Design a protein. Structure first.
Lengths: 67, 77, 52, 266, 77, 77, 77, 76, 77, 77, 77, 77, 77, 52
């Protein structure tokens, strides 16, 4: 698993270990697995899919941002 | 005799080149399509439509050529 | 061009020119350099103890 | 001297071969049939260049010191630098032999090739018109058999090191299962893997050989086909370039040797 | 006469080459069309406009080619 | 033995060119399949179905070429 | 006898090759035209002027091949 | 006599074209595979599996071309 | 007779291959030019300058081949 | 007689084409593997493993053609 | 008198392939050069110098094969 | 006698194909190596060391064709 | 005597193929070289160093071929 | 044909080749050697300063 930090300019929105996420990158929808090669992209407003280790899913709404 | 002889060769060039071209063109096309689909699974059908429409333009000349090959192999044989 | 029995003689010359370097050229050459490698490596630890 | 340009060219395409049954000299016009006819010109140059490399090195090796090196010693240690720098990262096992293997390959191959820059006709003149020798040529690597012997030596070594460092029990598995791994494919698998092994020494030999055979050829033609006041103007660029190939082929042979063995043993 | 099989092949060469050329060119152009479409799917009708408008230019020479190959294979031969 | 010799060159041409076409055209496509995989692993089943559906086009003409190759080789011989 | 029958073949060489060239030289340029245009659609009318200016040099030399092929094909054969 | 070298030439051309095709295809597909792996190194197994699945469809026609080339070269 | 009437096959090979070379090279150059223009849609005239600079280099040797094709067709033949 | 000429020609072409195939097929693969290392040298010893597992396949056809060329030299002459 | 036609055909191949090589090398190189120019137009007078200093090194061999074809045609007849 | 005219030709063609293969493959491999160099100095020695793992493998087949071509040209004929 | 022609024709093919192979292998590499230069313009000399190091490999087989072509054209004849 | 003229040709060729080597190739050789010697020598010098 890997560690995910979702942070706004104001306050922190998530922190915990993750098995995978699925994020709507500006160029295309993308998915990140442990050890993914360094990458940097904008992202579009929309949901983001987390699976907290032990597979427990959740969804978060974002106004955009950078991954 | 020779009228009986070069109607296989004559179709060889046509059908081989056509089979190359009609495969290369749409390999290119469908590759761009398939990545465009991986990047936007919202738009699989919308882009599938365009994939077919655009394919319709490539295989024209290949189909004419390969049909004339079939012609030379079975109609005039 | 032509195959030749030279193809064995050259192996005979090759392995000998190998032996004459193996046990008698490289160990000396690199060891005399390892002495120096240490002797410039030690200066840092010398000044390090001097500093401590 | 009735040598037409086409015919003069031929004499450099001709080796000075021995015949071991007769110890006789095989004349250029009729080539005897047999496998027992040594290429003296390649051998004498081979041994003389090898020995005058070893002499330069071993003279200092007995004497090497950790003071500031002698300039000649400085160059010895700098080519030791390139050699050890390559060995130092591509090899990871204990073996002693790897390093001097690669060194004796590199500098010796470079010397065998180094001769080509020698004015092409010069030394064949002292061969024919002085010591009474019917023909000659002055680049050992342009004679296939040396490259064949050396690369098939590396072939022996591939077999030897690989079997030493993983045994037959796994060597058979690799040689038979790959690449598809599923037991029905084994007979067809081994065919594809077999000559895949052999092409390594073969390509090592041929990549080097052809470069120097075709290297000499251009100088033969420079001599044969052009007037005095134009043989120099192609030769300036061609030397400018052939420097590069005669260096690169030795560097390639070295690195490829080490890499080929490393892949099998490590 | 022996020329009958020569007219067939002299047409077949131009036919196969026209097939290859048209297929590859239109495949490339369509591939870029399909990729561009994924970014701004609001634009696809304008993109498709441009696509047809230049694809009419992709094939002019192959449309000399096949025509003048048939000018042999169905008239002169 | 004269009259049939050309059938064995003609049987090779149409086979080999279909081989080149099919292999290269499906490789250029499998590359984009693999990218669409590596950007979104959990889409890999859908992209595999899409890959098959697309490749059903690419292989079309090559299959005809190789079929008529089989014909000329063994039936005509 | 050897006047016209091989002149067909030679003109076919000229014009089929020119067709390959003139299809692909339009294809690549058009691909970069589309994909660039898809990013900057508001600039299209300038881009297409540049396109035509470039194609004017692209196809000028194949035009020679095809017009010369016709000069052979109709007059000389 | 004048004939049989034609058969041998035809089998050589068969294998040559098939080798060109089945080498270029596998090379392209392999380059994309290696870079996809370098992107998500911990899906090497899944990608390698699906890479085999997609490769299988590439080799068919060239392997048949080798089959018939061998038949022409030795069965006739 | 063929001793002149085959000269046209020589001219065809030469100048058609030259047509391929000039067409593909000019097209590639123009495609990168168009992309640059779309990415610097004010810098254009300087890019057009440089495009014309390096453009003729693509046709430096094709033009000699054209010269010699017309040589074979209207000085020799 | 000339059967030696054309049998050596058979070996010639058999090896000649497979050489281009197996050279370019590795050029492509290494070209991608190198950039994969370029972004991140700490993955080099992994990618340089999967590289071999891939390149193993690239030679399966061409190193059949190689051995059969050598045979057609020294057995069939 | 067959001699004096193949003496021209050799020139046809020899000087077509050279034109293709020159065109392709210069086209690819110029395209990449123009992209470099567009991404930094302040920098052009350096890149252009490097461009020529490379481009000569591509065209070296085209311009010798051209020369040998010229010799074979004009001198050897 | 007829054996010369084609025993030399076989080697000519065989080594020409050997030239194309290696030239193209090494072109692309070195192109990606320079991509690495320009993107990531401070790695240049590491990239060089790896690159020469591959470069030898690219020459694997073609150099065999060049050796056998020299054999054909000087031992066979 | 006839014998002169086929030797010339054999050499011509070697030199044309060498021309294309070398020119492409250098143009690709130089393209990456220049697009790198446009990123690291201060470090041009280091790129030049490694560029020429590799260009020493690109040219191997092509100039082997040019040498053998010259030999065939002027001393085999 | 006269064998002699090749002699003058290769004389000119080798002379100018050697000019190229000396003026462009020997300097980098000696300069890399002098650079390595500077590194060795100042290494030992600073090592001895450290042992002082």
């Amino acid at each position: 698993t890997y560690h995910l930090d979702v942070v706004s300019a104001e306050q922190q929105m998530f922190s915990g270990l993750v098995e995978k996420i699925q994020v709507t990158g500006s160029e295309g929808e993308l998915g990140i697995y442990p050890g993914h090669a360094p990458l940097l992209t904008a992202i579009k407003p929309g949901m983001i899919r987390i699976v907290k280790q032990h597979g427990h899913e959740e969804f978060i709404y974002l106004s955009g941002g950078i991954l | 005799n020779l009228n009986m002889d070069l109607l296989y060769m004559a179709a060889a060039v046509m059908m081989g080149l056509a089979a190359i071209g009609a495969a290369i063109g749409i390999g290119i096309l469908g590759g761009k399509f398939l990545e465009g689909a991986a990047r936007q699974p919202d738009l699989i059908p919308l882009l599938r439509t365009q994939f077919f429409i655009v394919m319709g333009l490539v295989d024209a000349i290949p189909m004419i050529a390969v049909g004339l090959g079939l012609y030379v192999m079975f109609a005039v044989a | 061009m032509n195959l030749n029995a030279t193809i064995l003689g050259q192996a005979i010359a090759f392995v000998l020119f190998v032996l004459f370097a193996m046990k008698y050229v490289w160990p000396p050459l690199m060891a005399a350099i390892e002495k120096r490698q240490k002797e410039i490596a030690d200066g840092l630890a010398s000044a390090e103890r001097a500093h401590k | 001297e009735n040598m037409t340009p086409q015919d003069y060219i031929g004499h450099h395409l001709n080796n000075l071969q021995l015949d071991l049954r007769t110890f006789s000299l095989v004349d250029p016009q009729n080539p005897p049939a047999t496998f027992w006819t040594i290429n003296i010109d390649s051998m004498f140059f081979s041994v003389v260049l090898g020995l005058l490399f070893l002499v330069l090195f071993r003279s200092v090796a007995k004497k090497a010191t950790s003071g500031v090196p002698g300039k000649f010693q400085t160059a010895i240690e700098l080519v030791i630098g390139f050699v050890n720098g390559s060995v130092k990262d591509m090899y990871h096992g204990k073996s002693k032999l790897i390093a001097p293997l690669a060194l004796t390959i590199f500098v010796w191959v470079f010397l065998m090739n180094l001769m080509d820059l020698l004015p092409i006709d010069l030394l064949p003149y002292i061969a024919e018109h002085v010591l009474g020798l019917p023909a000659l040529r002055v680049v050992p690597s342009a004679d296939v058999n040396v490259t064949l012997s050396m690369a098939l030596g590396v072939f022996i070594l591939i077999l030897f090191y690989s079997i030493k460092m993983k045994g037959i029990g796994g060597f058979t598995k690799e040689l038979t299962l790959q690449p598809f791994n599923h037991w029905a494919f084994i007979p067809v698998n081994l065919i594809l893997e077999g000559v895949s092994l052999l092409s390594k020494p073969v390509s090592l030999g041929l990549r080097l050989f052809g470069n120097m055979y075709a290297g000499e050829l251009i100088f033969i033609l420079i001599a044969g086909l052009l007037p005095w006041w134009s043989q120099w103007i192609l030769n300036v660029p061609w030397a400018i370039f052939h420097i590069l190939i005669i260096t690169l082929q030795a560097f390639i042979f070295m690195v490829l040797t080490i890499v080929y063995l490393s892949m099998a043993s490590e």
